[PDB]
Every structure is written in structure tokens, then in C-alpha cells.
């Protein structure tokens, strides 16, 4: 119940938020951007994934 | 068959710990899970914790 609300809050999205449409080189700098406070947890973005 | 009786009266002083059930007036029970250090509580803008 708490874990599912955490997953739902993190894997969601918004119209226009911090870091709207930048490209990231993978998941690791997605985490770096979120922690740095440069991009919001849920903001639409292009990321390369393998 | 009883010659004399001695009654001794201890007085324990019990403190909060993980497991002690607490509740409120609105039917919301709860079993205390962690005695969280003061510096880790979420704190307000004037540094007063919760």
C-alpha cells in the first residue's frame, strides 16, 4: 500500500515540469538529474536504454 | 493455616518502546514501530520537528 503509492508517484508524468524534453544518456544520469534538483521526478524526457 | 502474610508493593515506571499500542479518539490504532532520533524527524521551516 505504501510501496505501491511510491511506485505510482514516481512512475507518473506532467505536462510541463523541470527538465521537459531533454535527452539523457541513460538511467544513471536521470537519477543524477533528479538528485541534483535539476529535473522533476516525473517530467517527460528521452532516455537511451539498453 | 496462614500464620502471616507479607505484601510488597513494587512500582514500575514504564516508558514508550516499539510495540506499545497507541491510538487517538477516532478509532485509529497503531503499534509504535521506531523511536526515531530527534534530528531525523521531518522539520518545519523554523526547524521545529514533528
Amino acid at each position: 500500500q505504501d510501496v505501491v503509492l511510491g511506485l505510482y508517484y514516481m512512475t507518473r508524468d506532467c505536462v510541463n515540469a523541470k527538465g521537459e524534453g531533454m535527452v539523457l544518456t541513460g538511467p544513471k544520469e536521470a537519477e543524477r538529474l533528479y538528485r541534483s534538483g535539476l529535473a522533476s521526478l516525473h517530467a517527460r524526457v528521452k532516455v537511451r536504454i539498453t | 493455616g496462614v500464620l502471616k502474610i507479607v505484601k510488597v508493593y513494587l512500582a514500575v515506571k514504564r516508558r514508550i518502546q516499539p510495540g506499545d499500542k497507541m491510538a487517538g479518539r477516532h478509532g485509529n490504532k497503531g503499534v509504535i514501530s521506531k523511536i526515531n532520533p530527534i534530528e531525523d524527524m521531518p522539520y518545519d521551516e523554523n526547524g521545529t520537528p514533528v
Binding site: - | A11, E45, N46, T48
Partner: protein, 180 residues
């Protein structure tokens, strides 16, 4: 304050004649005693008062190097003209919160029946907040400034508190600087 000892009182669940509070309320009034011990590491104060009126912390017979920063902190109340309270308050120095049970479990020494055991909340800092405003420098406009608002019992000087905190942090970071 770590231990208290009142005359003719065996345990804290009792009372005294002429005293408006129970010995438990006296111990709770003593926990919040804000003293500053200059030189030593453990001192023993003495309080003696008789007569109608409030027994405040200004009535502790002061050692030379013991300062009570709030001398209006009402210890107790005496309601009888023949009443008298005499008590020997042990003040220690330490950090953190050490409950009495932890001590008595760590102490195998048998104290006399009559030495009441107060819980110890050593740490002087009560509340602390901070704001990161923007500083003014001739060219660097991206510099900040940190304003730390401390609220204390009056026993630690703010500058010395920050010096101790910076010292603790630097001592701890030595493991990472000189790594393995």
C-alpha cells in the same frame, strides 16, 4: 542533573510534609535545570530552604565555578512555616540522552536507599533552523550565506557550539580523506 538526594526521603513515589509537590514533580522540575560547570566534570550542589514560598534555582548554594543561567526556575514550593527542604543535587557532564535505567544497569555499585536517580538529557541545543540567503560580493553573485538560528538552554555559547560541530565533522571526514 543526574542524581538527587533529599533529606528523609526514601523513594520518589513519596511526599514531604509542607511541600506542595510530590518528589516525582520535584525530579521533573530538576531535569530542566540549566547549569554550566566551568572547570570540573561533575559537581554536587546543595539546596537548603525553609519557610513559605517558592524554592527556585536561585537558592542553590553556588559553587565558585557553577553558573545557573536561569535562577528563576522554580524547583518546588513550601507551604508550611516549619517546612524545610535540604537536597544534594549531582550535576554531571555528557552528551545525548542517557536514561536512568541504562545507568543503573551499567552500574553494579549499590547506592544507598535514598539516592534518587534522575534521567539525564545532557544536550543543550533545543531547536535549530537555517536559511541559505544570497550573499553580496563584488563579482561573485552566485555565492551564498548560511544563517543558523539556534535556540538553547543558555549553557552553550553559539560560536563555541558551531566550532564543536565543525570539529566533529572534520574529525569524522578524516576516514574518507585518508582513505584506508
Amino acid at each position: 542533573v543526574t542524581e538527587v538526594e533529599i533529606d528523609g526521603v526514601l523513594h520518589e513515589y513519596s511526599t514531604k510534609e509542607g511541600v506542595q509537590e510530590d518528589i516525582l514533580e520535584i525530579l521533573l522540575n530538576l531535569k530542566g535545570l540549566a547549569v554550566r560547570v566551568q572547570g570540573k566534570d561533575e559537581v554536587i550542589l546543595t539546596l537548603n530552604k525553609s519557610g513559605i514560598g517558592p524554592v527556585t534555582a536561585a537558592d542553590i548554594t553556588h559553587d565558585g565555578d557553577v553558573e545557573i543561567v536561569k535562577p528563576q526556575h522554580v524547583i518546588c514550593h513550601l507551604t508550611d512555616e516549619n517546612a524545610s527542604i535540604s537536597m544534594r543535587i549531582k550535576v554531571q557532564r555528557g552528551r545525548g540522552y542517557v536514561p536512568a535505567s541504562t545507568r543503573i544497569h551499567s552500574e553494579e555499585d549499590e547506592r544507598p536507599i535514598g539516592r534518587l536517580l534522575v534521567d539525564a538529557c545532557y544536550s543543550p541545543v533545543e531547536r535549530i533552523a537555517y536559511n541559505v540567503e544570497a550573499a553580496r560580493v563584488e563579482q561573485r553573485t552566485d555565492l551564498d550565506k548560511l544563517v543558523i538560528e539556534m535556540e538553547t538552554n543558555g549553557t552553550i555559547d553559539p560560536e563555541e557550539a558551531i566550532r564543536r560541530a565543525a570539529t566533529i565533522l572534520a574529525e569524522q571526514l578524516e576516514a574518507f580523506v585518508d582513505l584506508r
